[PDB]
Write a protein that binds this ligand. Structure first.
Ligand SMILES: *[C@@H]1O[C@H](CO)[C@@H](O)[C@H](O)[C@H]1NC(C)=O
Ligand SMILES: [Ca+2]
Length: 476
């Protein structure tokens, strides 16, 4: 599927080993500290698609599928998929090639997309870097194909970042020489084959900043689908330019201010507001980026605060910002794990409650976003517009005039005071009746133009023209 095809999507990102076992167990042990394979499979995912689609997601992103180093290392098993050894084989832990194709067709039979995580930067090896036996890797079975061993000593040196090895001497990550024509052609041919063999709709590309830029356009083209890159850097001036060589990148620039804005009652709404504008302007296309506040490479949101109302606000933002929302399996169950491997909790241990607070929050927000898109072909291309802020509040507007969604978000928390906010800028016609689609109440636009927004318990508010909801299953 195309970048255009992807704008309207919203992604549930999951760890294949950790989302759902074939046996459907909700009790199967998974001590994250043990870093072992816990049992999750592609077929397990298939059996839980009702749970995923019931939150209003239109796609999933799954961890890499290539066969991994087999050893149980001092850092555990390759359960996450980032330590590949044989790229023309699948990781048997998740099932068979038929299983992967089954997941793909099952997603498609529901009108959903499959996104797959891929690594081009490196392989994985159990052992010291200098001692690597290259013969294990397929097809890159000789030192020939790799950058000479060295570690990234200085991250300000972009040449070191690209030419030296990630990892360490316990689990080393032999770094492919992605400037060699033979390496390019092998990867380019592989990625097209992968996508065709399994009917893959999109790619999430790992460790993008660790590969020289002139590698990516050819890779993206070969893939023949939307590619969104992990560029692990919070500076828009470093990260957005990668969108010049690749369809999208994950929105790490928004990530930091977003997290700070909502992780405490004293978070800076100013930084968030500004970053939205900086990204909107200086990024080739903000609507092709992916928004998230939680993933497998950072502490989970709920690890910073257990305030449910804060979690509600940051989730609403992810869904309603420009670009593609990305929610990380477990976030909807208020998972609170810290840094790797604590943030790789098995989803099945939650019991998959479909009536939990954040599950319902996310369903409501996706419901409106999805509806708005079905009516307003200009929604996805309309660049989100921050219209208001204060010390505890931010409001924003997205959608063609007369059909816009206006979102008011707060970091007051669950003990926030009741009160009324007068909102200038919404651009609704005076006396117009609007629905608040989370709590399902109504409000009328003032004559002064302003909107009388009832604020209570630090809850999120999402407004949308009541007449426009006609015939939707929203708020019945
Ligand atoms: C795609 O299918 C062909 C033929 O079955 C196979 O040889 C090739 O290895 C597959 N490509 C990938 C990336 O697995
Ligand atoms: Ca590299």
């Amino acid at each position: 599927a195309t970048p255009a095809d992807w704008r309207s999507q919203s992604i549930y990102f999951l760890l294949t080993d950790r989302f759902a076992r074939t046996d459907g167990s909700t009790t199967a042990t998974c001590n994250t500290a043990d870093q072992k394979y816990c049992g999750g499979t592609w077929q397990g995912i298939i059996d839980k698609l009702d749970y995923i689609q019931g939150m209003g997601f239109t796609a999933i992103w799954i961890t890499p599928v290539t066969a991994q180093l087999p050893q149980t290392t001092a850092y555990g098993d390759a359960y996450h998929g980032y330590w590949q050894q044989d790229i023309y084989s699948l990781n048997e832990n998740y099932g068979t090639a038929d299983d992967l194709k089954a997941l793909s067709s099952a997603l498609h039979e529901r009108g959903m997309y499959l996104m797959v995580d891929v690594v081009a930067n490196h392989m994985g090896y159990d052992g010291a870097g200098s001692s690597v036996d290259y013969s294990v890797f397929k097809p890159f079975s000789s030192q020939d194909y790799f950058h000479p061993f060295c570690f990234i000593q200085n991250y300000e040196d972009q040449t070191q970042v690209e030419d030296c090895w990630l990892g360490d001497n316990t689990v080393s990550l032999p770094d492919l020489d992605t400037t060699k024509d033979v390496v390019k052609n092998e990867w380019y041919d592989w990625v097209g084959s992968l996508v065709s063999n399994y009917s893959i709709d999109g790619l999430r590309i790992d460790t993008v900043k660790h590969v020289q830029k002139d590698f990516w356009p050819g890779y993206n083209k070969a893939a023949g689908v939307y590619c969104i890159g992990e560029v692990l850097d919070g500076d828009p001036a470093y990260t957005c330019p990668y969108q010049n060589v690749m369809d999208g990148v994950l929105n790490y620039p928004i990530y930091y201010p977003l997290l700070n804005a909502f992780k405490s009652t004293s978070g800076s709404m100013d930084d968030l507001y500004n970053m939205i504008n900086t990204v909107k302007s200086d990024c080739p296309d903000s609507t092709l980026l992916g928004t998230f506040v939680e993933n497998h490479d950072n502490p989970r949101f709920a690890s910073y605060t257990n305030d449910i109302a804060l979690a509600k606000n940051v989730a609403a933002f992810i869904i309603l910002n420009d670009g593609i929302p990305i929610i990380y399996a477990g976030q909807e169950q208020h998972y609170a794990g810290g840094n790797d491997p604590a943030n790789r909790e098995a989803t099945w241990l939650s019991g998959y409650p479909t009536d939990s607070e954040l599950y319902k929050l996310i369903a409501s927000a996706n419901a409106i976003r999805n509806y708005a898109i079905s009516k307003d072909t200009g929604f996805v291309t309309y660049k989100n517009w921050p219209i208001y802020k204060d010390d505890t509040t931010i409001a924003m507007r997205k959608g063609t005039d007369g059909s816009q969604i206006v979102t008011i978000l707060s970091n007051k928390g669950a003990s926030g005071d009741s009160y009324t906010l007068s909102l200038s800028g919404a651009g609704y016609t005076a006396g117009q009746q609007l629905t608040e689609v989370i709590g399902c109440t109504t409000v009328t636009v003032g004559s002064d133009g302003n909107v009388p927004v009832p604020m209570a318990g630090g809850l999120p508010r999402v407004l949308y023209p009541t007449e426009k909801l006609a015939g939707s299953k929203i708020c019945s």
